[PDB]
């Protein structure tokens, strides 16, 4: 986890990388917030 | 008050084919241009649908056996059919479903009523007031320990009212679709999709169902309220849902336009 070349070296498990294009990891956008939406209620349940 | 009155003519009921009728939205999921196959309690195409008449004299309201799901259709303009009553005993021993839809309200009260053996609703009309009002409410003797209550807006031989009543998992589901019908004696061959109206959570054992009709004695009956009455014309159809796999075709707007009985 230093730079893409080192990640390629780790993915190939070798210290020497031949010329080419290699897939190393997956890029994914992590969520930022949380959203809750539910119908309007104003009365508690009769658990009493 | 309970009244047991029968002056109708005796003749065996008629039978018809159900045709491509009685298809409802199985779920509340929107789909566009997708052919979706489901396995639900559907009405087989061209099924053996029973026909009941209420001509003027016929008032046949038998205790039909409500099997797993029941299809029901009506073409009429006098609003003779008001509601339906369900139950295993139709007695004050066990809870019985009861629905009444007159012109003014829809009433659902799940109570174990002491049902009269001949439930009906009586409407009397006078010329001076020019109003049709219901004098006698004799579908049951008394309220008798209601356990569920619900009232909503009324549902509105030239109009077709198609309902599907299905009881599963302690829930009583009603699917209805109002459509203008031009023919006055038989179901049209057109395809119609029934949208859900309400999932009333009743959860009672139901084995036998009945329909509630209304009389319209205004001035043509001279007899007592035990053998004499008069009303209009009504016809209704009863089918039975079976476990069926159906291929439903959704258009781009999300409404079912075609179906296939596998």
């Amino acid at each position: 986890a230093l730079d893409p070349l080192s990640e390629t070296k780790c993915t190939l498990k070798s210290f020497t990388v031949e010329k080419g294009i290699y897939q190393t990891s997956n890029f994914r956008v992590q969520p930022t917030e949380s959203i809750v939406r539910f119908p309007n209620i104003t009365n508690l349940c009769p658990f009493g | 008050q309970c009244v047991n009155l029968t002056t109708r003519t005796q003749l065996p009921p008629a039978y018809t084919n159900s045709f491509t009728r009685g298809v409802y939205y199985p779920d509340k999921v929107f789909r566009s241009s997708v052919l979706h196959s489901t396995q639900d309690l559907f009405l087989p195409f061209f099924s053996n649908v029973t026909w009941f008449h209420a001509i003027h004299k016929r008032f046949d309201n038998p205790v039909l056996p409500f099997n797993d799901g029941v299809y029901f259709a009506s073409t009429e303009k006098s609003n003779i059919i008001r509601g339906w009553i369900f139950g295993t005993t139709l007695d004050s021993k066990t809870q019985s479903l009861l629905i009444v839809n007159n012109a003014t309200n829809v009433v659902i009260k799940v109570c174990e009523f002491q049902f009269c053996n001949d439930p009906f609703l009586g409407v009397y009309y006078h010329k001076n007031n020019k109003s049709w009002m219901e004098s006698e409410f004799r579908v049951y003797s008394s309220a008798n320990n209601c356990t569920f209550e619900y009232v909503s807006q009324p549902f509105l031989f030239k109009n077709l009212r198609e309902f599907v009543f299905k009881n599963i998992d302690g829930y009583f589901k009603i699917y209805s679709k109002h459509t203008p019908i031009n023919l006055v004696r038989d179901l049209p061959q057109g395809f119609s999709a029934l949208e859900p109206l309400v999932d009333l959570p009743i959860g009672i054992n139901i084995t036998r169902f009945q329909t509630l009709l209304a009389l319209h004695r205004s001035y043509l009956t001279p007899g007592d309220s035990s053998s004499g009455w008069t009303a209009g014309a009504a016809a209704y159809y009863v089918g039975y849902l079976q476990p069926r796999t159906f291929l439903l075709k959704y258009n781009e707007n999300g409404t079912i336009t075609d179906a296939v009985d596998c």
């Binding site: 956008v29 992590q30 969520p31 930022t32 917030e33 949380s34 959203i35 809750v36 939406r37 539910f38 119908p39 309007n40 | 939205y25 509340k28 999921v29 929107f30 789909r31 566009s32 997708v34 949208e195 859900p196 707007n253 999300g254 409404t255």
Partner: protein, 49 residues
């Protein structure tokens, strides 16, 4: 919040994604849509419809 990668749970349907104003026309009893391969891709808000 719209146009952001956010978690959500609308009437029990829980997921992660970006919510955008749509042009689909739900019938006034359906709650959410689905794809050809049964994938949730549209949800009606339980408050603003």
């Amino acid at each position: 919040v719209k146009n952001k990668c956010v978690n959500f749970n609308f009437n029990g349907l829980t997921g992660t994604g970006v919510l955008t104003e749509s042009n689909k026309k739900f019938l006034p009893f359906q709650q959410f849509g689905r794809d050809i391969a049964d994938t949730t891709d549209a949800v009606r808000d339980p408050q603003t419809l």
